[model samples]
Target chain A: TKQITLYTATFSPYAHRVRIALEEAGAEYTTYDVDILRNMPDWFPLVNPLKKIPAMTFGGPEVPPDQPSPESAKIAESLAMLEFIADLFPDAKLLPTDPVLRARARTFMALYENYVNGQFRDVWFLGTPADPLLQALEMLQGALPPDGGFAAGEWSIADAAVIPFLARMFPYLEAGLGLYSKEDGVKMRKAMASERFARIRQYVRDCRARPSFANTWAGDAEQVEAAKTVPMLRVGEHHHH
Target chain B: KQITLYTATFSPYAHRVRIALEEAGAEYTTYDVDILRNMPDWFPLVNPLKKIPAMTFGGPEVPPDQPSPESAKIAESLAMLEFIADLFPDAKLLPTDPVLRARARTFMALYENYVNGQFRDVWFLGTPADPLLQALEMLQGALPPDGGFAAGEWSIADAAVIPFLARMFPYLEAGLGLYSKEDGVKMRKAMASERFARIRQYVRDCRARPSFANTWAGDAEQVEAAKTVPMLRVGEHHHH
Candidate 1:
């Protein structure tokens, strides 16, 4: 029986979350890439009404005797898909089993989803007014353990959920797309280098070294350089993908 | 240890958090914030945003000196719900299976994006046709074919969406002034139409739950009473 086909785009951090988890789990899977900036395939909407990348089909292509068509087996939304795989393979240790630790991990994901992602979206797609962006960075810095550990004290689902977004931010910063004003960036850079951000910076370094990350890092230098020339949206012209 | 939920009668967002607590049968106290009056000075210290349904876990009195005994405050309803689920794993407010949990979350996200965002606009401006109707139409398509609960069975997804629907029940039953006077009856009829029968039944099933009853027994009356007054925007009078 065929299993685990991931529909993804190379540049999407959302899809990257799923890929990292799948790799960490060592789950047998294949990929179907879509050029998201270009037109989507005709059949994509049948799988996901939102027409978003990072969709998946769990079973094989054909309808089994007892089951519906493979089309009916399609799952969309990255976080859900990540959990589906994580739960399917418990040995992967993608999610913590302990109740308190699980809550801690989930809480970090919530903060990233609610605050960090939105602020980064505004900074990357739209222009500055980088106050919220800075607040989100500070929040992440504060959330990490003082002793330098993963979000839930281990490399769990929270790390997979957030590391992709963090990876994407580095390129944006390198390109200086208003992640901070020039003077502010200089100051922030120093702080990031200092001990105050020690845990947060170490977490990033650890995540980058994971084998899962090698396959998912989309921040090529050429892409970062290309982003510098794109026109940015004014405030209130925001859109979600 | 004591748990406190800072809430307001008018907020469905707060109600969502209450449902989860009640479902878990967690011991907690609630402090009602009166927006018509000034907020307590201590609220800002507990929650920098000073939003309602702010929750604290620790002691009844005195901040304990030890880390384990010290009170910890959590804000934002979504985060609070996940925390409750984690804190009370046996209650199974959230599904244990990863796929099911993911599905539940996606369903809740749909409710937040499609329904919750536009609900305030309909309540305050009486503009019902675009957002409320559009959101309902989407919700209807997303419901299970056999009319099972949201996300297949009772879960946080149900808890998340039902509170908002419960608060709006009176208006839906009567088709209030969210449309033109001439269109009022027509809107109400459409709301109660066959297309929404599953949703109506879902509301009834939700109301039958003891947890829902315990949290929202007086909410219907509270909502109706508040509707008689002009709606106050968050910043129109008192600051949070």
Candidate 2:
């Protein structure tokens, strides 16, 4: 009776990562699509005091039914919550078994989620709406290994965290956000296509291929396509998806 | 194959080393020393930093005949445990692979960066109630949703960090130190729950060990006898 609830939007990469993680973990979840485009909701603030999406509510087995709590337990930070869910159901074992290997997986997730993702927020959402795609591509160059692929040689938390963001941000970078010149856009796309980031490019390609991923992603294409014209990452307003 | 733990009782840094030793099934000896007095010249090899919780591997190659040899020193509580875990790969105190290792480090860093930073100011520097509350909020946010361990499994990160929290909470509740009403008690009580039973047991277990008992055992007596108090507070408590 206790279904997992995911507060998400189609256009946001952060939400998609949560969706993909849930799919990979094979956990059943109901999506509460927030119209972040038109207006941020009051309910979201209660779920996450910071008012960010990808906020999830975990109840049922983890929650003692006898305990009187409506919210049950709320976890924030997309990567952190995703990992928490991945751990909760070990059968999926979306992470590696070896402790060291697991640590490496987590490390990449932390570095990308904190450093690279932090930069994305600056360039796209909080800062000037320039073509952040190139900057994101450039930042990612030194991050991946030589042979273009997933971060940990498997479908890992790191891979899950990245593909969606790039998918959404790519077109916006090409169009330019009115904050920077078209030349910036070219540099950014060139960075995305760079040899050093081959593994990263392959990561995007790999995720785009999986069937479950395909199903979730097919639902995503319309929103991603519309991202080209959209300015503010407004999820609800862009109804194409 | 035997381990060596350098410590002072009542020192949280030392308590961390003790906890790891018990969890890992490591066979080790203890070198307990007094810290209120000046650190001895010989301690540099084991703990050049003079900070407690230095662990060493005193194998035939490393320590030779000298149990507490100058050549056998490994300083820094966190760094020393890292070396021991490597020496005994089967123990798995930390993850071996780079990515998982990095993940553990991030959580470790989160605690050190945000939680410790705020708590230290509150406990050590006499931060007022409001700022302490704000800091605790940030710290609480770092807890896992299941609201137990920082990392899912009990990890080196957990072993290294919990001691500082243990020391601060009781001190805060005592009102002998600066404290926040809600966050202060709540964070500590949350950590105290059965979810943290392993960690709680580990802390209690360490203090019972002979090494810690021998070193910091007379801590209270030493404090009482000494003419000048130890440095928990500044020379003067500046009231605003």
Best by TM-score: 1
What range of 10 consecutive residues in model 1 chain A has the weakest lDDT sum?
A232-241
Please provide, for model 2 over B1-240, each residue's C-alpha lDDT reduced to its tens digit, 9 standing for 90 to 100: 556777665576677777677667777777766655766666655644456665555445344224445334454565454555555678776664433444455456556545665665665555554554455455545545443445445567667666665565455444333334454555567556764555455445444544345434344443332223264442333233
Interface RMSD in Å per candidate, to 1 decimal?
2.5, 9.1
Docking class of 2: incorrect
The CAPRI category of model 1 is acceptable
Candidate 2 local lDDT, A171-195, one digit each (tens): 6665444233345545566767777
lDDT of each: 0.69, 0.58
Stretches of candidate 1 off by over 4 Å are A60-72, A176-199, A222-241, B1-3, B33-37, B44-49, B58-69, B87-90, B95-98, B120-132, B171-190, B217-220, B224-231, B234-240
True contacts kept of each: 0.40, 0.00
Tell me the DockQ of each model, to 2 decimals.
Answer: 0.42, 0.06
**CA deviation > 4 Å runs, candidate 2:** A36-41, A60-71, A126-149, A178-183, A218-221, A224-241, B1-135, B138-240
The sequence of per-residue lDDT tens digits that candidate 1 reaches over residues B11-66 is 77788888889998898777776633566766765665556767777645643222
- Worst lDDT 10-window in candidate 2 chain B: B220-229
